[PDB]
């Protein structure tokens, strides 16, 4: 997923909050950093670890849902892409 991408301020700070530097990422990098954010903030359920809690987290504001499952791949990519701007470039 080499899609060249520039997050909107809120996703961007979400990513920067766990140490990302740039304004301009591949989709791959975004996914790496987003998974890290979720683990670093301890948003995943301990027992059913595909479940992610977003209530009173920043992640809830971006995604507009209180919880979601990582198994919902299309929904996940939809909720990401619409916090994201696709550049006119590789």
């Amino acid at each position: 997923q080499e899609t060249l991408v520039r997050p909107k301020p809120l996703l961007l700070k979400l990513l920067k909050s766990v140490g990302a530097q740039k304004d301009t990422y591949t989709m791959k990098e975004v996914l790496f950093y987003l998974g890290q954010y979720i683990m670093t903030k301890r948003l995943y359920d301990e027992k059913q670890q595909h479940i992610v809690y977003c209530s009173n987290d920043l992640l809830g504001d971006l995604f507009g849902v209180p919880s979601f499952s990582v198994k919902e791949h299309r929904k996940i990519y939809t909720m990401i892409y619409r916090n994201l701007v696709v550049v006119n470039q590789q």
């Binding site: 997923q1 791959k28 998974g35 979720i38 990582v70 791949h73 990519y77």
Partner: peptide
């Protein structure tokens, strides 16, 4: 069980 990390890796890396 499956780790969250493992679930997340399946999204696409």
């Amino acid at each position: 069980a499956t780790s969250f990390a493992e679930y997340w890796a399946l999204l696409x890396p």
